[PDB]
Structure formats: structure tokens, C-alpha cells
Design a protein around this nucleic acid. Structure first.
Lengths: 36, 36, 36, 36, 36, 36, 36, 36, 36, 36, 36, 36, 36, 36, 36
RNA sequence: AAAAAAAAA
RNA sequence: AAAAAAAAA
């Protein structure tokens, strides 16, 4: 038994929010829960 | 048994929100729950 | 048994929301639940 | 048994919402549940 | 048994909503459930 | 047994909504359930 | 047994809604269930 | 002077190549200039 | 002078290549200039 | 002079290559200039 | 002079390559200039 | 002179390469100039 | 002269390469110039 | 002269490479110039 | 002359390489010029 | 003929 | 009838 690279992962992995935003001249809110 | 690259993953993986946004001249809200 | 590249994944994977948006001159909301 | 590239995946994969939007001069909402 | 490229997938895959939209001068809503 | 490229998929695959829309000067809603 | 390219798929595949729409000067709704 | 929706466009608009192709079990090339 | 929605565009707009392709079990090339 | 929404754009806009491709079990190249 | 939303853009905007690709079980190259 | 939202942009904006790719079980190259 | 939100931008803005890629079980290269 | 929010930018802005990549079980290279 | 928020920027701004990568079980290289 | 979703800290 | 492109540090 020889394994050279084994990143074994068992279970749950959750990356829920992924945003790539480029905004050169801007007013911007990223993932913002603004209320009232 | 020889494996050279084994990223074995068992279970659940959830990437729910993925946004690529380019907005050069803009007012912009990205994944924003603005309420009232 | 020799495997050179084995990204074995068993289970559930869910990428629910995927948006690619380019908006040069814009007011824009991306994946935004604006309420009232 | 020699396999050179095996991305074996068993289970369920769901990419529900996929939008490619280019909007140069625009007011735009992408995947937005605006209510009232 | 030699396989050179085997992306074996067993189960269910569902890409329900796929929209390619180009809208240069526009007000536009893409996959938007606007209510009232 | 030698197979050079085998993307074997068994099960169910459903791409329900596929729209290609080009709308240069426009007000447009794409896959939008606007109610009232 | 040598197969050079085998995208074997067994089961059910359903692409229900496919629309190609070009609308240069337009107000347009594509696959829109507008109610009332 | 009151206009409710005016997507006025003046000039030239050219959508030269528009193809809607559904091909369930197929080898297919779409708008492909294969040479030799 | 009151205008409610005016996406006025003057000039040239050219959407030359528009293809909607669904190909469930397939080898396919889309808008591919394969040479020799 | 009151205008409520004016995305005025003057000049040239060119969306040359627009492809919507769903390919569940497939080897596929999309907008690929493969040479020799 | 009152304007409520004016994303005025003057000049040239060019979104040349726009591809929406869903490929569940696949070997795929997207906008790839593979040479020799 | 009262303007409420003015993202005025004058000049040239070029979003040349825009790809939305979902590939659940796959070997895939996205916008890759692989040579020899 | 009262302006409420003015992200005025004059000049040139170029977002050349924009890719949104979801690849759950995969070997993948994104915007990779692999040579020889 | 009263301006409430003025992110005035004059000149050149260039966001050349923008990639959003989710790859749960994977060997992956992102924007990698691997040579030989 | 009253301005409430003025982030005035004149000149050149260049954000050349922007990558958002989520890779749960993986061997991965991000913006890596690996040579030989 | 369809759908969906989500989330969070 | 077309096209394109790019890039970089």
C-alpha cells in the first residue's frame, strides 16, 4: 500500500456564499443584509 | 496498491451561491437581502 | 492496482445558484432578495 | 487495473440556476426575488 | 483493464435553469420572481 | 479492455429551461415569474 | 475490447424548454409566467 | 409628452447566425468551420 | 416631458453568432474552427 | 424634464459569440479553435 | 431637470465571447485554443 | 438639476471573455491555451 | 445642482477574462496556459 | 453645488483576470502557467 | 460647494488577477507558474 | 410544462 | 458569412 498524495476527507463541507466582484467606479454592498 | 493522487471525499458538499460580477461604473448590491 | 488521478467523490453535491454578470454602466442587484 | 484519470462521482449533483448575463448600459436584477 | 479518461457518474444530475442573455441597452430582470 | 475516453453516466439528467436571448435595445424579463 | 470515445448514457434525459430569441428593439418576456 | 416604454434604437443591428439544435444521441458540430 | 422607461441606444449593435444546443449523449463541438 | 429610467447608450456594442450548450454525457469543445 | 436613474454610457462596449455550458458527465474544453 | 442615480461612464469598456461552466463529473479546461 | 449618487467614470475599463466554473468531481484547469 | 456620493474616477481601470471556481473533489490549477 | 462623500481618484488603477477558489478535498495550485 | 431557492453569523 | 483574442506578473 503506497499512496503518493491522499487528502482524504469524510463528512460534510459547505461553502455557501462565494462572490467575485470587480467594481471600479462604484457604490457597492457585497453580501450585505441592510435592513431599513 | 499504488495511487498517485487521491483526493477522496465522501459525504455532502454544498456550494449554494456563486456569483461572478464585473461592474465598472455602477451602484451594485451582490447577494444582498435588503429589506424595506 | 495503479490509479494515476482519482478524485473519487461519493454522496451529494449541490451548486444551486451560479451567475456570471458583466454590467459596465449599470445599477444592478445580483441574487438579491430585496423585500418592500 | 490501471486508470489514468478517474473522477468517479456517485450520488446526486444539482446545478439548479445558471445565468450568463452581459448588460452594458442597464438597470438589471439577476436571480432577484424582489417582493412588493 | 486500462482506461485513459473515465469521468464515471452514476445517479441524478439536474441543471434546471440555464439562460444566456446579452442586453446592451436595457432594463432587464433575469430569472426574477418579482411579486406585486 | 482499453477505453480511451469514457464519460459513462447512468441515471437521470434533466436540463429543463434553456434560453438564449439577445436583446440590444430592450426592456426584457428572462424566465421571470412576475405575479400581479 | 478497444473503444476510442464512449459517452455511454443510460436512463432518462429531458431538455423540456429551448428558446433562441433575438430581439433588437423590443419589449420581450422569454419563458415568463406572468400572472395578472 | 408622456411615453411609458420607449426602447428607441437607431442605426444598424445584425444577428447573422441563429441556430437552435437539439441532438440527443449524436456526434454534432454547430457553426463549425472544420477545414481539412 | 415625462418618459417612464427609455433605454435609448444609437449606433451599431452586432450579435453575430447565437447557438442554442442541447446534446444529451454526444461528442460535440460548438462554434469550433478545428483546422487539420 | 422628468425621466424615470434612462439607460442611454450611444456608440457601438458588439456581442459577437453567444452559445448556450447543455451536454449531459459528452466530450465537448465550446468555441474552441483546436488546430492540428 | 430631474432624472431618477440614468446609467448613461457613451463610447464602445464589446462583450465578444459569451458561453453558458452545462456538462454533467464530460471531458470538456471551453473557449480553449488547443494547438497541436 | 437633480439626478438621483447617475453612473455616467464615457469611453470604452470591453468584457471580452465570459464563460459560465457547470461540470459535475468532468475533466475540464476553461479558457485554456494548451499548446502541444 | 444636486446629485444623490454619481459614480462618474471617464476613460477606459477592460474586464477581459470572466469565468464562473463549478466542478464538483473534476480535474480542471481554469484560464491555464499549459505549454508542452 | 451639493453632491451626496461622488466616487469620481478618471483614467484607466483594467480588471483583466476574474475567475470564480468551486471544485469540491478535485485536482485543480487556477490561472496557472504550467510550462513543461 | 458641499460634497458629502468624495473618493475622487484620477490616474490608473489595475487589479489584473482576481480568483475566488473553494476546493474542499483537493490538490490545488492557485496562480502558480510551475515550470518543469 | 416548469420551477426554485436560500441563508447566515 | 464570420471571427477572435489575450495576458501577465
Amino acid at each position: 500500500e503506497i499512496v503518493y498524495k491522499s487528502p482524504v476527507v469524510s463528512g460534510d463541507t459547505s461553502p455557501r456564499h462565494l462572490s467575485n466582484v470587480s467594481s471600479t467606479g462604484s457604490i457597492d454592498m457585497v453580501d450585505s443584509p441592510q435592513l431599513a
